[PDB]
Each structure stands twice: as C-alpha cells, then as structure tokens.
Amino acid sequence: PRYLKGWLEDVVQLSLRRPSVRASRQRPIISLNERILEFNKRNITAIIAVYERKSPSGLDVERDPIEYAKFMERYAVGLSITTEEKYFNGSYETLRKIASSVSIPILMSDFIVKESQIDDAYNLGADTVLLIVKILTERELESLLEYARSYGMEPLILINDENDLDIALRIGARFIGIMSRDFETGEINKENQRKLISMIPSNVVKVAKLGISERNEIEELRKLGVNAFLISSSLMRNPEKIKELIE
Numbered sequence: 001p002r003y004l005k006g007w008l009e010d011v012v013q014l015s016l017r018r019p020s021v022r023a024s025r026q027r028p029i030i031s032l033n034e035r036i037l038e039f040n041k042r043n044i045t046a047i048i049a050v051y052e053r054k055s056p057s058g059l060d061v062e063r064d065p066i067e068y069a070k071f072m073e074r075y076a077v078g079l080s081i082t083t084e085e086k087y088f089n090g091s092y093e094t095l096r097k098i099a100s101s102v103s104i105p106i107l108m109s110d111f112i113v114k115e116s117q118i119d120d121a122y123n124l125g126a127d128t129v130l131l132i133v134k135i136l137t138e139r140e141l142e143s144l145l146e147y148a149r150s151y152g153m154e155p156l157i158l159i160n161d162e163n164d165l166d167i168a169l170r171i172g173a174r175f176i177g178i179m180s181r182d183f184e185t186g187e188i189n190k191e192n193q194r195k196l197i198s199m200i201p202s203n204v205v206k207v208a209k210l211g212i213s214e215r216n217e218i219e220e221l222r223k224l225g226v227n228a229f230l231i232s233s234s235l236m237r238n239p240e241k242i243k244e245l246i247e
C-alpha cells in the first residue's frame with residue numbers, strides 16, 4: 001500500500017491482516033455496471049443504496065440489515081455493503097446475509113489491499129468490489145483490478161482528485177466512483193467532485209459517492225453525465241427518501 005497517515009494508515013494495516021473466509025456463492029455474478037447502463041436507458045435514476053452502521057463522516061446508527069435490504073430491493077439499482085469493521089462497524093456476515101436476501105447486484109465496500117479480500121467478496125456473494133486509488137500504489141491497483149476481472153467483476157475504482165484519475169484511466173478503469181469528501185481535509189467538496197466528473201471519458205460508467213443528498217443535486221449531476229449515485233447516510237437515516245430521490 002501507499003504510506004499514509006492517521007486513520008487511513010490504521011485501516012490499511014488492519015486490512016492487511018483481515019482473515020479470509022471459506023464460503024460458496026449461491027448464484028452467478030450480476031453485473032452492477034451493466035444494470036446501471038440499463039437504468040440509464042430507461043431514465044430511471046440509478047441509486048446504489050449503502051448499508052453501513054457507522055462512518056468517520058459522522059453516521060452512527062443501528063438498523064436491521066435484511067429489513068433495509070428488502071426495502072431497498074424495490075427501488076435501488078444495487079446495494080453497497082461496507083464490510084470494514086473498525087471505523088464502519090461492518091462485517092462479512094452482514095454482506096453474506098444481505099447478498100442472500102435480495103436479487104439486485106451487490107458492491108462490497110472496504111479497504112482492499114490484498115487478493116484474499118476480493119476472494120472474500122466473491123465467495124460471500126458480492127458482484128463487485130471497491131478499489132481505492134489513494135491507498136494503493138499504481139502497480140498494486142493494476143494487479144487488483146486484473147484479479148477482480150478474473151472473477152468476472154468490474155471493480156468500482158474510487159478517485160478523490162486528478163492524480164487518482166490519471167492512474168485510474170491509465171490502467172483502463174471502466175467503472176469509476178468520484179468521492180465528495182476529501183481524504184486530506186475530511187471535508188465535503190462538491191465543486192471538486194463536479195470537476196472530476198467532467199474529466200472522465202464517456203465510455204466509463206461514473207458513480208457519484210454521497211452521504212447526504214437531495215433530488216435537485218441528483219438531477220444536476222445526471223445532467224453532467226453521472227450514471228449512478230452511491231448514497232449512504234441519508235438513506236441509512238431515512239430509507240424512504242430513496243423514493244423521492246428517484247421520482
């Protein structure tokens with residue numbers, strides 16, 4: 001991994017030692033990026049609803065994962081399950097249960113630094129994984145992209161700035177997430193997110209990552225070429241908001 005500071009360095013070290021699972025998935029991969037493109041054709045706003053109890057951004061709640069997932073199955077293009085334990089209060093069992101409770105595609109959301117974490121995602125039923133440019137060297141990111149693809153996954157490669165984008169495009173990312181919160185400052189920076197979106201070629205499926213959001217903002221971003229929205233806090237706090245965000 002990169003040499004990092006603070007909580008991000010800590011979560012990387014923890015991830016390096018994450019024990020792997022032994023499990024068999026129950027169905028083939030369903031492509032998340034392809035379903036997004038289907039929703040786009042039909043002008044159905046494509047929201048990837050996040051299940052996570054906690055975040056360093058300030059979310060800290062309890063909610064039954066299966067009840068949340070079954071509600072979201074009706075509306076969301078896919079679900080993202082944050083499996084990082086220490087900072088996000090996630091778990092592999094949470095992913096397993098959700099992926100086994102609904103029919104729509106599943107993103108595993110964690111700090112992936114080794115191949116066995118991709119094995120874990122696949123074996124627990126996820127359809128794809130998040131890879132984060134900032135935490136990996138370019139060589140590591142390239143290798144993990146290839147490894148995900150060897151399972152039939154197209155990972156969601158998460159960028160925070162132009163430097164991250166340069167790397168992601170060079171290695172041929174086809175599914176890019178654009179953060180709204182800055183790793184360096186801890187602050188929401190919506191202007192930077194829109195700039196980055198405008199730098200991504202049309203052949204890449206683009207996902208805007210958001211905690212709080214509102215329908216107005218979704219419409220504007222869609223206008224700018226965003227294909228889908230990865231939304232956490234506001235849906236964890238009020239699940240029914242997704243209906244207003246897509247209608």
Ligand SMILES: *C(C)CC(=O)c1ccc2cc(OC)ccc2c1
Nearest residue numbers: 055056057109179181182183186
């Ligand atoms: C996405 C799974 C997480 C995300 O974008 C995020 C969460 C929390 C957080 C905290 C920061 O400083 C405390 C910076 C960035 C950041 C990003």
